[PDB]
Write a protein that binds this ligand. Structure first.
Ligand code: 90F
Length: 300
């Protein structure tokens, strides 16, 4: 019923729907098997993520998914974002087929890989050694910055950059997800807690929260929060601070403390991202270059 785009259109019969991954405000995500995503290999199997309308779908929901689809087409391909692979718009439900990151989002990736605590019996020569090291953490931050720099060059504002919206591949490559969504910025329930207990307001820049103003610099603020998440190994920002208290603290210019086991170089970048004036925050290009210096210095 939608117009046919032969550039992106993919035969829905070449999809085998599998386990549901989750869902957002609009549309659900289902893992699926795809055959011949690469036209040079028609019978080759690959794992993809399929976005589709729920059974609740109003047209507003359909409009949002169609809007997301067209955004995907225009942004282009980059290593550090979830890329569009194809769509299904003809003779059946609307499918938006995007890349699949095997290890889930960055927050859960970090939380599941926190080092063994004071309770484990020393078994082997690496008992104190956890899965996560400092240079890899820096690499995670650096890749997200590169991805955001690309999105910025494509004039794309994320408006909810967080560790939960950064996905991790089998090779630990950071991929930014859900960058092209209509997020209803004019009707945000600031007290709304997600099913996994997240308060999205804690990632909002002041100009976004108070003035409903969104720029790339507002994403830089959110990136600073994401930096805090990474080096707390998936910690929740503003620990033990309810939304009501967050409002007044932000008005007082309150900022998060330096997390434990976090070098001053990176807390310095966090605080720079949290400067009140958006113009006094680093650009993503500057963030990429700054984090690159740290990464190269620790990559002997
Ligand atoms: C296609 C390979 C795959 O399964 N990937 C996967 C599984 C998951 N999960 C979530 C945890 C889930 N476990 C199951 C056991 O009980 C605890 C939860 C296992 C599957 C989450 C992901 F972000 C991903 N990674 C995604 N790759 N491509 C996506 C496209 C959209 C997408 O969106 C879902 C709603 C999502 C999810 Cl589920 C979690 N964080 C962020 C997002 Cl954006 C996730 C992925």
């Amino acid at each position: 019923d939608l117009p046919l785009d032969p550039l992106w259109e993919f035969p829905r019969d070449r999809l085998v729907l599998g386990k549901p991954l989750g869902e957002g405000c609009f549309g659900q995500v289902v893992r699926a098997e795809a055959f011949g995503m690469d036209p040079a290999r028609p019978d080759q199997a690959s794992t993809v993520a399929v976005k589709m309308l729920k059974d609740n779908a109003s047209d507003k929901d359909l409009a949002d998914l169609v809007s997301e689809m067209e955004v995907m087409k225009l942004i282009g391909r980059h290593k550090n974002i979830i890329n569009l692979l194809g769509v299904c718009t003809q003779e059946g439900p609307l499918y938006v087929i995007v890349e699949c990151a095997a290890k889930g989002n960055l927050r859960e990736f970090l939380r599941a890989r926190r080092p063994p605590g004071p309770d484990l019996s020393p078994d082997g020569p690496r008992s104190s050694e956890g899965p996560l090291s400092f240079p890899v953490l820096v690499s995670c931050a650096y890749q997200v910055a590169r991805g955001m720099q690309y999105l910025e060059s494509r004039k794309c504002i994320h408006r909810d950059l967080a560790a939960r919206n950064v996905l991790v591949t089998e090779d630990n490559v950071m991929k930014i997800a859900d960058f092209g969504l209509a997020r209803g910025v004019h009707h945000i329930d600031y007290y709304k807690k997600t099913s996994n207990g997240r308060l999205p307001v804690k990632w909002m820049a002041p100009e976004a929260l108070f003035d409903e103003v969104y720029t790339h610099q507002s994403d830089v603020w959110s990136f600073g929060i994401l930096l805090w998440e990474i080096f707390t190994l998936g910690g929740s920002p503003y620990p033990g601070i309810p939304v009501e208290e967050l409002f007044s603290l932000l008005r007082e210019g309150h900022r998060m403390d330096r997390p434990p086991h976090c070098p001053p170089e990176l807390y310095g970048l966090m605080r720079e991202c949290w400067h009140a004036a958006p113009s006094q925050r680093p650009t993503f290009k500057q963030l990429v270059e700054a984090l690159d210096k740290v990464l190269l210095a620790v990559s002997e």
